[PDB]
Amino acid sequence: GAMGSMERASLIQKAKLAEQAERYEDMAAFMKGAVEKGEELSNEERNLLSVAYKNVVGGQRAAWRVLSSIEQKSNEEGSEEKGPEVREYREKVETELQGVCDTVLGLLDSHLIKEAGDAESRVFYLKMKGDYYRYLAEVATGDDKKRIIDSARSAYQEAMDISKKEMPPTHPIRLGLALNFSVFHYEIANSPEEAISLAKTTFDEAMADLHTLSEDSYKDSTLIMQLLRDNLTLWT
Amino acid sequence: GAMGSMERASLIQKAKLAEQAERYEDMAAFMKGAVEKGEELSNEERNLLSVAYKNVVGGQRAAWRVLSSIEQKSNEEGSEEKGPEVREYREKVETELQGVCDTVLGLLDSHLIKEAGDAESRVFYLKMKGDYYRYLAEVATGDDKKRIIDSARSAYQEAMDISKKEMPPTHPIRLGLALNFSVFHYEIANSPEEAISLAKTTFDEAMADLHTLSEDSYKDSTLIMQLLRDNLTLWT
Amino acid sequence: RRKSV
Amino acid sequence: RRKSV
Ligand SMILES: COC[C@H]1CC[C@@H]2/C1=C\[C@]1(C)C(=C([C@H](C)COC(C)=O)C[C@@H]1O)[C@@H](O)[C@H](O)[C@@H]2C
Ligand SMILES: COC[C@H]1CC[C@@H]2/C1=C\[C@]1(C)C(=C([C@H](C)COC(C)=O)C[C@@H]1O)[C@@H](O)[C@H](O)[C@@H]2C
Ligand SMILES: [Cl-]
Ligand SMILES: [Cl-]
Ligand SMILES: [Mg+2]
Ligand SMILES: [Mg+2]
Ligand SMILES: [Mg+2]
Ligand SMILES: [Mg+2]
Ligand SMILES: [Mg+2]
Ligand SMILES: [Mg+2]
Ligand SMILES: [Mg+2]
Ligand SMILES: [Mg+2]
C-alpha cells in the first residue's frame, strides 16, 4: 500500500502515462510501488525509476537553492531582521527533499542492490546511491556531513570499479556515472583537480572507442560526452 | 490547521517565498491558511491567492488534457485494448483537479465573497468563482454538467455587471474577467459569436479610454488587451 | 492555445 | 550550471 493492491504491470503503465503528463511525483510513487513488488527491474524500468526521482528531487533542489540564497542575503550586514520565516520554509523544503532521498536510498537498500548481479544493473543502482547521498550532502551542515559525503564517494567508487572492469568506455551508464562522480569531486569533495582529470580521461577513453559503435550507439554516447565537455569548458 | 498555528503575516511572507521558489502547491496552502484567518484580503494578497491556485490547477488541467487525449486515441477504431489503466489514471488526476476547484470555491463561499464590498474585490472573487466552475465544466460529462456551466456563467455575469457599473473599461480586472468570460463562451457554452463580440467590444472600449491613463497603467491595460487580440486573431 | 488570465 | 545526468 498504497500501491500494494495494484498490478505491477499497471504501475509500470501508469508510470509511463505520468511521465507523458509530466506528473513526476505520481510517476515516482508508481515506480516505488513497482519496486516494492519485489521482482528485479528491467533496463527500461530502471530508467523510469531514475527519471521519476531525478525530476522530483531536481525540483526540490532548485527550490532549496532559491530559498538558501534568500536566507543568505538575510544574514548579510545591514539586512533588516525579518523573523524566522525564511529559515523555517527553507527547512520545510529541505526536510521534504531529505525524505525523498531517504525513500530512494531505502529502495536501493531494500532490495534493489543486493539482487542486482549484471554490471548494467549494479552500476546503475550504485550510481543512484551516489547521487542521492550527494543530494543529502548538498544540504548537510552538521555532525554527519563527513559520513554522508563518504557514503556518496564509496557508492560512486564501487560503481566506477565495476564499470571499468565490465563495461565499454562508451557505455552511457559508465559515462553518466563519471560525469556525476566528477561533479561530486568538484563541488562536494572540494577536489576540482580530481573532477577535471576524471572528466578528461573519461571523455578521451570514450573518444577512442567510438569507432566500435553503430550510428545509434554513437549518438547515445556522444550525447553524454558533450555534457563532460560542457563541464570541462566551465571549469577550465 | 494545519495552518491554524501560523501567524497570518508569516503565511503571507511564506506564500511570497514559495512563489519565488515556484512551489505553487505550498504557496496555495499558505494562502488558504491566510484566508482561513477570517480577515479580508488586501489587493496584493488577493493576487497571491489567485496566482497560487491558477498555477496549481493549470498544471492539473494540462495533465488532464494529455491523459484525455491518450484515452481518446485508445477508444478509436483498431486501437489495441490496453485495460482500464488510462481511464483510471485520468480519473485520478481529474478527481484531484476537482478537489482543488472545490477548495477554492469553498474559500470564496466561506467567506470571501460575502465580506467583499468594494468593486475591485467583489469582481475579482466573482471572476475566480467563474474560473473554477469553468475548470469543473472542462471535465464534467454527466447529470450536473449543465448546472456547473450555469454556475460559471452566473458568477461571470454578476462580475461583468458590477465591473461595467463600477470600474473603468481599462481596469486590468475588468479586462481579465472579459477575456475569461469570452473563453467560457467560446469553448464551454458553444457560443463562439458571443465570445468574439465580447472580446471585440471589450478591446475597443478599453482602446478609447487609454488616453486617461498614466504610462504605468497604460502598460498594465495594454498587456491584457493584447491577450484579447490574440484570441480574436485565433478565432477569426 | 487561446489566452486566459 | 554544471551538467549532471
Ligand atoms: C542512474 O543514472 C541513470 C543515468 C545514467 C546515464 C543515463 C541515465 C538516465 C537516463 C534514463 C538516460 C538518459 C540519456 C542521457 C538520454 O535519453 C536517451 C535518448 O538515451 C537520461 C535519462 O535520465 C538513459 O537513456 C541512459 O541510457 C543512461 C541510463
Ligand atoms: C481573479 O483574476 C485575477 C486576474 C485578473 C487580471 C489580472 C489577474 C491576475 C494577476 C494577479 C495579474 C496579472 C497581470 C496580467 C500581470 O502582472 C502584472 C505585472 O500586472 C496576471 C496575474 O495572474 C494582476 O497583476 C492584474 O492586475 C489582474 C488582477
Ligand atoms: Cl514553513
Ligand atoms: Cl490511478
Ligand atoms: Mg500480479
Ligand atoms: Mg534597515
Ligand atoms: Mg535541516
Ligand atoms: Mg539478480
Ligand atoms: Mg496573529
Ligand atoms: Mg491490433
Ligand atoms: Mg470523474
Ligand atoms: Mg468588507
Coordinates of C-alpha atoms and ligand atoms in Angstrom, one line a residue:
Chain A
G1 CA 0.0 0.0 0.0
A2 CA -0.9 2.4 -1.1
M3 CA 0.4 0.7 -4.3
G4 CA 0.0 -2.7 -2.7
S5 CA -3.3 -3.5 -4.5
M6 CA -2.2 -2.5 -8.0
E7 CA -0.7 -4.9 -10.5
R8 CA 3.0 -4.5 -11.2
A9 CA 2.3 -4.1 -14.9
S10 CA -0.4 -1.5 -14.3
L11 CA 2.0 0.5 -12.0
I12 CA 4.6 0.5 -14.9
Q13 CA 2.0 1.5 -17.5
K14 CA 0.8 4.4 -15.2
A15 CA 4.4 5.5 -14.6
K16 CA 4.7 5.9 -18.4
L17 CA 1.5 7.9 -18.6
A18 CA 2.6 10.1 -15.6
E19 CA 5.9 10.7 -17.5
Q20 CA 3.9 11.8 -20.6
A21 CA 1.8 14.1 -18.4
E22 CA 4.9 15.5 -16.6
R23 CA 3.4 14.3 -13.3
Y24 CA 6.7 13.2 -11.7
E25 CA 5.5 12.8 -8.2
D26 CA 2.9 10.3 -9.4
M27 CA 5.5 8.7 -11.7
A28 CA 7.8 8.2 -8.7
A29 CA 5.0 6.9 -6.5
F30 CA 4.1 4.3 -9.2
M31 CA 7.7 3.2 -9.6
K32 CA 8.2 2.9 -5.8
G33 CA 5.1 0.6 -5.9
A34 CA 6.6 -1.4 -8.7
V35 CA 9.9 -1.9 -6.9
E36 CA 8.1 -2.9 -3.8
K37 CA 6.6 -5.8 -5.7
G38 CA 9.9 -7.4 -5.0
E39 CA 10.8 -8.5 -8.6
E40 CA 14.0 -7.2 -10.3
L41 CA 13.6 -4.3 -12.7
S42 CA 14.3 -4.4 -16.4
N43 CA 16.5 -1.8 -18.2
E44 CA 13.5 0.2 -19.3
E45 CA 12.0 0.0 -15.7
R46 CA 15.3 1.1 -14.1
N47 CA 15.2 4.1 -16.4
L48 CA 11.6 5.0 -15.4
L49 CA 12.5 4.7 -11.7
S50 CA 15.6 7.0 -12.1
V51 CA 13.8 9.6 -14.3
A52 CA 10.8 9.9 -11.8
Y53 CA 13.0 10.6 -8.8
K54 CA 15.6 12.7 -10.6
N55 CA 12.8 15.0 -11.6
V56 CA 11.1 15.2 -8.2
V57 CA 14.3 15.8 -6.4
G58 CA 15.6 18.2 -9.1
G59 CA 12.6 20.4 -8.4
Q60 CA 13.1 20.3 -4.6
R61 CA 16.9 21.1 -5.0
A62 CA 16.2 24.1 -7.3
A63 CA 13.7 25.4 -4.7
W64 CA 16.1 24.8 -1.9
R65 CA 18.7 26.8 -3.7
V66 CA 16.4 29.7 -4.3
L67 CA 15.4 29.8 -0.5
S68 CA 19.0 29.2 0.7
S69 CA 20.2 32.2 -1.4
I70 CA 17.4 34.4 0.1
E71 CA 18.3 33.2 3.6
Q72 CA 22.0 34.0 3.0
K73 CA 21.1 37.5 1.9
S74 CA 19.0 37.9 5.1
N75 CA 22.2 37.1 7.1
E76 CA 24.3 39.8 5.4
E77 CA 25.4 43.0 7.1
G78 CA 22.7 45.7 7.2
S79 CA 19.9 43.3 6.1
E80 CA 16.7 44.0 8.0
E81 CA 15.6 41.3 10.5
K82 CA 12.5 39.6 9.0
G83 CA 12.0 36.8 11.6
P84 CA 12.3 33.1 11.4
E85 CA 10.1 32.5 8.3
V86 CA 12.9 32.2 5.6
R87 CA 14.8 29.7 7.7
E88 CA 11.5 27.8 8.6
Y89 CA 10.4 27.4 5.0
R90 CA 14.0 26.5 3.7
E91 CA 13.9 23.8 6.5
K92 CA 10.5 22.6 5.4
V93 CA 11.7 22.2 1.7
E94 CA 15.0 20.7 3.0
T95 CA 13.2 18.1 5.1
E96 CA 11.0 17.1 2.2
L97 CA 14.0 16.8 -0.1
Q98 CA 15.7 14.6 2.6
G99 CA 12.7 12.4 2.8
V100 CA 12.8 11.8 -0.9
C101 CA 16.4 10.9 -0.8
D102 CA 15.8 8.6 2.1
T103 CA 13.0 6.9 0.2
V104 CA 15.2 6.2 -2.8
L105 CA 18.1 5.0 -0.7
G106 CA 15.6 2.8 1.1
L107 CA 14.5 1.2 -2.2
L108 CA 18.1 0.7 -3.2
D109 CA 18.9 -1.0 0.1
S110 CA 15.7 -3.0 0.3
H111 CA 16.4 -4.8 -2.0
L112 CA 17.5 -3.5 -5.4
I113 CA 21.2 -3.5 -4.9
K114 CA 21.6 -6.9 -3.3
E115 CA 19.7 -8.7 -6.1
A116 CA 21.5 -6.8 -9.0
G117 CA 24.1 -9.2 -10.5
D118 CA 24.6 -7.8 -14.0
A119 CA 27.0 -4.9 -14.5
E120 CA 24.4 -2.7 -16.1
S121 CA 22.0 -3.0 -13.2
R122 CA 24.6 -3.0 -10.4
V123 CA 26.4 0.1 -11.7
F124 CA 23.1 1.9 -12.4
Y125 CA 21.8 1.4 -8.8
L126 CA 25.2 2.3 -7.2
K127 CA 25.3 5.5 -9.3
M128 CA 21.7 6.4 -8.0
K129 CA 23.0 5.6 -4.4
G130 CA 26.0 8.0 -5.0
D131 CA 23.6 10.6 -6.5
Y132 CA 21.1 10.5 -3.6
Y133 CA 23.8 10.7 -0.9
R134 CA 25.2 13.5 -2.9
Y135 CA 21.9 15.4 -2.7
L136 CA 21.8 14.8 1.0
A137 CA 25.4 16.2 1.1
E138 CA 24.3 19.4 -0.7
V139 CA 22.1 20.4 2.3
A140 CA 24.1 18.8 5.1
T141 CA 25.7 21.2 7.6
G142 CA 26.2 19.2 10.8
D143 CA 27.9 16.2 12.6
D144 CA 27.1 13.8 9.9
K145 CA 28.2 15.8 6.8
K146 CA 31.5 13.9 6.5
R147 CA 29.9 10.5 6.7
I148 CA 27.2 11.4 4.2
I149 CA 30.0 12.6 1.8
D150 CA 31.9 9.4 2.3
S151 CA 28.7 7.3 1.6
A152 CA 28.3 9.2 -1.8
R153 CA 32.0 8.6 -2.5
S154 CA 32.0 4.9 -1.6
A155 CA 29.0 4.1 -3.7
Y156 CA 30.4 6.1 -6.8
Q157 CA 33.7 4.4 -6.3
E158 CA 32.2 0.8 -6.2
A159 CA 30.2 1.7 -9.4
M160 CA 33.4 3.1 -11.1
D161 CA 35.3 -0.1 -10.3
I162 CA 32.7 -2.4 -11.7
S163 CA 32.0 -0.2 -14.8
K164 CA 35.7 -0.1 -15.6
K165 CA 36.0 -3.9 -15.4
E166 CA 32.7 -4.8 -17.1
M167 CA 31.5 -2.1 -19.5
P168 CA 33.0 -0.4 -22.5
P169 CA 34.3 3.1 -22.1
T170 CA 31.4 4.4 -24.3
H171 CA 28.6 2.8 -22.2
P172 CA 26.0 5.6 -21.4
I173 CA 25.8 4.4 -17.8
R174 CA 29.6 4.5 -17.5
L175 CA 29.7 8.0 -19.0
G176 CA 26.8 9.3 -16.8
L177 CA 28.4 7.9 -13.6
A178 CA 31.7 9.5 -14.4
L179 CA 30.0 12.8 -15.2
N180 CA 28.3 12.7 -11.8
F181 CA 31.3 11.5 -9.8
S182 CA 33.3 14.3 -11.4
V183 CA 30.6 16.8 -10.2
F184 CA 30.8 15.2 -6.7
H185 CA 34.6 15.8 -6.7
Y186 CA 34.2 19.4 -7.9
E187 CA 31.5 20.7 -5.7
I188 CA 31.1 18.3 -2.8
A189 CA 34.6 17.0 -2.1
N190 CA 36.4 20.3 -2.8
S191 CA 38.6 18.4 -5.3
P192 CA 38.3 20.4 -8.6
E193 CA 41.6 18.8 -9.9
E194 CA 40.2 15.3 -9.5
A195 CA 36.8 16.4 -11.1
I196 CA 38.7 17.8 -14.2
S197 CA 41.1 14.8 -14.5
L198 CA 38.1 12.4 -14.2
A199 CA 36.0 14.3 -16.9
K200 CA 39.0 14.5 -19.3
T201 CA 40.1 10.9 -19.0
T202 CA 36.5 9.7 -19.3
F203 CA 36.0 11.8 -22.4
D204 CA 39.2 10.7 -24.1
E205 CA 38.8 7.0 -23.4
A206 CA 35.3 7.2 -24.9
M207 CA 36.5 9.1 -28.0
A208 CA 39.0 6.3 -28.7
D209 CA 36.1 3.6 -28.5
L210 CA 33.6 5.5 -30.8
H211 CA 34.8 3.6 -33.8
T212 CA 33.4 0.3 -32.5
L213 CA 29.8 1.6 -32.4
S214 CA 26.7 1.6 -34.6
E215 CA 25.2 5.0 -35.6
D216 CA 22.6 4.8 -32.8
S217 CA 25.1 3.9 -30.1
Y218 CA 27.4 6.6 -31.4
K219 CA 24.5 9.1 -30.9
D220 CA 23.8 7.8 -27.3
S221 CA 27.5 8.0 -26.2
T222 CA 28.4 11.4 -27.8
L223 CA 25.3 13.0 -26.1
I224 CA 26.8 12.3 -22.6
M225 CA 30.3 13.0 -23.8
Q226 CA 29.1 16.6 -24.6
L227 CA 28.0 17.0 -21.0
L228 CA 31.6 16.0 -19.9
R229 CA 32.9 18.6 -22.4
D230 CA 30.5 21.3 -21.1
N231 CA 31.8 20.8 -17.6
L232 CA 35.4 20.9 -18.7
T233 CA 34.7 24.1 -20.5
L234 CA 33.0 25.6 -17.5
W235 CA 35.8 24.5 -15.1
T236 CA 38.9 25.4 -17.1
Chain B
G1 CA -4.8 23.6 11.0
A2 CA -2.7 22.7 9.5
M3 CA -2.0 26.4 9.0
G4 CA -4.0 27.2 12.2
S5 CA -1.0 27.8 14.3
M6 CA 0.9 30.1 12.0
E7 CA 0.6 33.8 12.1
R8 CA -1.3 35.4 9.2
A9 CA 1.7 37.6 8.3
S10 CA 4.0 34.6 8.3
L11 CA 1.7 32.7 6.0
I12 CA 1.7 35.7 3.6
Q13 CA 5.6 36.0 3.8
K14 CA 5.9 32.3 3.1
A15 CA 3.5 32.5 0.2
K16 CA 5.8 35.1 -1.4
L17 CA 8.9 32.9 -0.8
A18 CA 7.0 29.8 -2.3
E19 CA 6.2 31.9 -5.3
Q20 CA 9.9 32.9 -5.8
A21 CA 10.8 29.2 -5.5
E22 CA 8.0 28.2 -7.9
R23 CA 6.5 26.0 -5.2
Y24 CA 2.8 26.6 -6.1
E25 CA 1.2 23.9 -4.0
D26 CA 2.9 25.3 -0.9
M27 CA 2.0 28.9 -2.0
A28 CA -1.6 27.8 -2.3
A29 CA -1.7 26.0 1.0
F30 CA -0.2 29.1 2.7
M31 CA -2.8 31.4 1.1
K32 CA -5.6 29.0 2.1
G33 CA -4.3 29.3 5.6
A34 CA -4.2 33.1 5.4
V35 CA -7.8 33.3 4.1
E36 CA -8.9 30.9 6.9
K37 CA -7.7 33.5 9.4
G38 CA -11.0 35.2 8.6
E39 CA -9.8 38.7 7.8
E40 CA -10.4 40.3 4.4
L41 CA -7.5 40.2 1.9
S42 CA -5.7 43.2 0.5
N43 CA -5.2 43.7 -3.2
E44 CA -1.7 42.2 -3.1
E45 CA -3.0 39.2 -1.1
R46 CA -5.9 38.6 -3.5
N47 CA -3.2 38.5 -6.2
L48 CA -1.2 35.9 -4.3
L49 CA -4.2 33.7 -3.7
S50 CA -5.2 33.8 -7.3
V51 CA -1.7 33.2 -8.6
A52 CA -1.1 30.2 -6.3
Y53 CA -4.3 28.3 -7.4
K54 CA -4.1 29.3 -11.0
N55 CA -0.7 27.7 -11.2
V56 CA -1.7 24.5 -9.3
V57 CA -4.9 24.0 -11.3
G58 CA -3.2 24.9 -14.6
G59 CA -0.7 22.1 -14.1
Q60 CA -3.5 19.6 -13.3
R61 CA -5.5 20.8 -16.3
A62 CA -2.6 20.5 -18.7
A63 CA -2.0 16.9 -17.3
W64 CA -5.7 16.0 -17.7
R65 CA -5.6 17.1 -21.3
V66 CA -2.6 14.9 -22.0
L67 CA -4.3 11.9 -20.5
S68 CA -7.7 12.7 -22.0
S69 CA -6.1 12.7 -25.5
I70 CA -4.4 9.4 -24.8
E71 CA -7.7 7.9 -23.6
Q72 CA -9.5 9.2 -26.7
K73 CA -6.9 7.6 -29.0
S74 CA -7.4 4.3 -27.1
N75 CA -11.1 4.5 -27.9
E76 CA -10.6 4.8 -31.7
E77 CA -11.2 2.1 -34.2
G78 CA -8.5 -0.5 -34.4
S79 CA -6.7 0.7 -31.2
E80 CA -5.5 -2.3 -29.2
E81 CA -7.3 -2.9 -25.8
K82 CA -4.9 -1.8 -23.0
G83 CA -7.1 -2.3 -20.0
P84 CA -8.5 0.2 -17.5
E85 CA -5.3 2.0 -16.6
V86 CA -5.6 5.1 -18.9
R87 CA -9.1 5.8 -17.7
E88 CA -8.2 5.1 -14.0
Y89 CA -5.2 7.5 -14.1
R90 CA -7.2 10.2 -16.0
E91 CA -9.9 9.8 -13.3
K92 CA -7.2 10.1 -10.5
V93 CA -5.9 13.4 -12.0
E94 CA -9.5 14.5 -12.7
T95 CA -10.5 13.9 -9.1
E96 CA -7.6 15.8 -7.7
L97 CA -8.3 18.7 -10.0
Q98 CA -11.9 18.7 -8.9
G99 CA -10.8 18.8 -5.2
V100 CA -8.7 21.9 -5.9
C101 CA -11.6 23.6 -7.6
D102 CA -13.9 22.7 -4.7
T103 CA -11.3 24.0 -2.2
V104 CA -11.2 27.4 -4.0
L105 CA -14.9 27.6 -4.3
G106 CA -15.2 26.8 -0.6
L107 CA -12.9 29.7 0.3
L108 CA -14.9 32.1 -1.9
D109 CA -18.1 30.9 -0.4
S110 CA -16.7 30.8 3.2
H111 CA -16.4 33.8 3.5
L112 CA -14.5 35.9 0.9
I113 CA -17.4 36.9 -1.4
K114 CA -19.9 37.8 1.3
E115 CA -17.5 40.3 3.0
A116 CA -16.2 41.8 -0.2
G117 CA -17.9 45.2 -0.6
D118 CA -15.5 47.2 -2.9
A119 CA -15.8 46.6 -6.7
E120 CA -12.2 45.6 -7.0
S121 CA -12.5 42.8 -4.5
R122 CA -16.1 41.7 -5.4
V123 CA -15.4 41.5 -9.1
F124 CA -12.0 39.7 -8.5
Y125 CA -13.6 37.0 -6.3
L126 CA -16.6 36.5 -8.7
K127 CA -14.2 36.1 -11.6
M128 CA -12.3 33.4 -9.6
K129 CA -15.7 31.8 -8.9
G130 CA -16.5 31.8 -12.7
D131 CA -13.0 30.5 -13.4
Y132 CA -13.1 27.5 -11.0
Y133 CA -16.6 26.5 -12.1
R134 CA -15.3 26.7 -15.7
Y135 CA -12.5 24.3 -14.8
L136 CA -15.0 21.9 -13.3
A137 CA -17.0 22.4 -16.6
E138 CA -14.0 21.3 -18.6
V139 CA -14.0 17.8 -17.2
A140 CA -17.8 17.4 -16.5
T141 CA -19.5 14.7 -18.5
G142 CA -22.7 13.8 -16.5
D143 CA -26.1 14.9 -15.0
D144 CA -24.6 18.0 -13.4
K145 CA -22.7 19.4 -16.5
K146 CA -25.5 22.0 -17.3
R147 CA -25.7 23.3 -13.7
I148 CA -21.9 23.6 -13.4
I149 CA -21.8 25.6 -16.7
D150 CA -24.6 27.8 -15.5
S151 CA -22.8 28.4 -12.2
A152 CA -19.7 29.6 -14.2
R153 CA -22.0 31.8 -16.3
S154 CA -23.9 33.4 -13.3
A155 CA -20.7 34.2 -11.5
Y156 CA -19.0 35.8 -14.6
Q157 CA -22.2 37.7 -15.4
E158 CA -22.5 39.2 -11.9
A159 CA -18.9 40.2 -12.1
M160 CA -19.5 41.7 -15.6
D161 CA -22.4 43.8 -14.3
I162 CA -20.5 45.2 -11.3
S163 CA -17.3 45.9 -13.4
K164 CA -19.3 47.7 -16.0
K165 CA -21.0 49.9 -13.4
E166 CA -18.0 50.5 -11.1
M167 CA -14.7 50.2 -12.9
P168 CA -13.2 51.9 -15.9
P169 CA -13.0 50.0 -19.2
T170 CA -9.3 49.8 -18.9
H171 CA -9.2 48.2 -15.4
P172 CA -6.9 45.1 -15.6
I173 CA -9.5 43.1 -13.6
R174 CA -12.3 44.2 -15.9
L175 CA -10.2 43.2 -18.9
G176 CA -9.1 39.8 -17.4
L177 CA -12.7 39.0 -16.5
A178 CA -13.9 39.7 -20.0
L179 CA -11.0 37.7 -21.5
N180 CA -12.1 34.7 -19.4
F181 CA -15.8 35.1 -19.9
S182 CA -15.1 35.3 -23.6
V183 CA -13.2 32.0 -23.4
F184 CA -16.1 30.5 -21.4
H185 CA -18.5 31.5 -24.3
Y186 CA -16.2 30.1 -26.9
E187 CA -15.3 26.7 -25.6
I188 CA -17.7 25.9 -22.7
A189 CA -21.0 27.4 -23.8
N190 CA -20.6 26.7 -27.6
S191 CA -21.2 30.4 -28.3
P192 CA -18.2 31.5 -30.4
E193 CA -20.1 34.5 -31.8
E194 CA -20.7 35.8 -28.3
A195 CA -17.0 35.1 -27.3
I196 CA -15.9 37.2 -30.4
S197 CA -18.3 40.1 -29.8
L198 CA -17.3 40.2 -26.1
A199 CA -13.6 40.2 -26.9
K200 CA -14.0 42.9 -29.6
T201 CA -16.2 45.3 -27.6
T202 CA -14.0 44.9 -24.6
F203 CA -10.9 45.7 -26.6
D204 CA -12.4 48.7 -28.3
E205 CA -13.9 50.2 -25.2
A206 CA -10.5 50.0 -23.5
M207 CA -8.7 51.5 -26.6
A208 CA -10.9 54.6 -26.2
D209 CA -10.1 55.0 -22.5
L210 CA -6.2 54.6 -22.8
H211 CA -5.8 58.4 -23.1
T212 CA -6.9 58.9 -19.4
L213 CA -4.0 56.7 -18.1
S214 CA -0.5 57.2 -16.7
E215 CA 2.4 55.3 -18.5
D216 CA 2.4 52.5 -15.9
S217 CA -1.4 52.0 -16.1
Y218 CA -1.2 52.1 -19.9
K219 CA 1.3 49.2 -19.8
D220 CA -0.9 47.2 -17.4
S221 CA -4.0 47.6 -19.5
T222 CA -2.4 47.1 -22.9
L223 CA -0.8 43.9 -21.7
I224 CA -4.3 42.2 -21.2
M225 CA -5.7 44.0 -24.3
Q226 CA -3.1 42.0 -26.3
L227 CA -4.5 38.7 -24.9
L228 CA -7.9 39.8 -26.2
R229 CA -6.3 40.5 -29.6
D230 CA -4.5 37.1 -29.6
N231 CA -7.9 35.3 -29.1
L232 CA -9.6 37.4 -31.8
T233 CA -6.8 36.6 -34.2
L234 CA -7.1 32.9 -33.3
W235 CA -10.9 32.8 -33.7
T236 CA -11.4 34.9 -36.8
Chain C
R1 CA -3.8 27.8 -27.4
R2 CA -6.3 30.6 -26.6
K3 CA -5.3 33.0 -23.8
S4 CA -6.9 33.2 -20.4
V5 CA -5.6 35.1 -17.3
Chain D
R1 CA 25.2 25.5 -14.3
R2 CA 27.4 22.4 -14.5
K3 CA 25.8 19.3 -16.0
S4 CA 24.8 16.1 -14.3
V5 CA 22.7 13.3 -15.5
Ligands
LIG1 C1 21.2 6.1 -12.7 O1 21.7 7.1 -13.7 C2 20.9 7.0 -15.0 C3 21.6 7.9 -16.0 C4 23.0 7.4 -16.3 C5 23.2 7.9 -17.8 C6 21.8 7.7 -18.4 C7 20.8 7.9 -17.3 C8 19.4 8.3 -17.4 C9 18.5 8.3 -18.4 C10 17.5 7.2 -18.1 C11 19.1 8.2 -19.9 C12 19.4 9.4 -20.4 C13 20.1 9.8 -21.7 C14 21.2 10.7 -21.4 C15 19.0 10.5 -22.7 O2 18.0 9.6 -23.1 C16 18.3 8.8 -24.3 C17 17.5 9.1 -25.6 O3 19.1 7.9 -24.3 C18 19.0 10.5 -19.4 C19 17.9 9.8 -18.6 O4 17.7 10.4 -17.3 C20 19.3 6.8 -20.4 O5 18.8 6.8 -21.7 C21 20.9 6.5 -20.5 O6 21.0 5.3 -21.2 C22 21.6 6.3 -19.1 C23 20.8 5.1 -18.2
LIG2 C1 -9.0 36.7 -10.4 O1 -8.4 37.1 -11.7 C2 -7.0 37.7 -11.5 C3 -6.6 38.2 -12.9 C4 -7.5 39.3 -13.5 C5 -6.5 40.1 -14.4 C6 -5.2 40.2 -13.5 C7 -5.2 38.8 -12.7 C8 -4.1 38.2 -12.2 C9 -2.7 38.6 -11.9 C10 -2.6 38.7 -10.4 C11 -2.3 40.0 -12.6 C12 -1.7 39.7 -13.8 C13 -1.2 40.7 -14.8 C14 -1.8 40.3 -16.2 C15 0.4 40.6 -15.0 O2 1.1 41.1 -13.8 C16 1.3 42.4 -13.7 C17 2.8 43.0 -13.8 O3 0.4 43.3 -13.5 C18 -1.6 38.2 -14.0 C19 -1.7 37.6 -12.6 O4 -2.1 36.2 -12.5 C20 -2.6 41.2 -11.8 O5 -1.4 42.0 -11.9 C21 -3.7 42.0 -12.6 O6 -3.7 43.3 -12.0 C22 -5.1 41.4 -12.6 C23 -5.6 41.2 -11.0
CL3 CL 7.2 26.5 6.8
CL4 CL -4.5 5.6 -10.9
MG5 MG 0.2 -9.6 -10.0
MG6 MG 17.3 49.0 8.0
MG7 MG 17.8 20.6 8.3
MG8 MG 19.7 -10.8 -10.0
MG9 MG -2.0 36.6 15.0
MG10 MG -4.1 -5.0 -33.1
MG11 MG -14.8 11.8 -12.9
MG12 MG -15.8 44.3 3.5

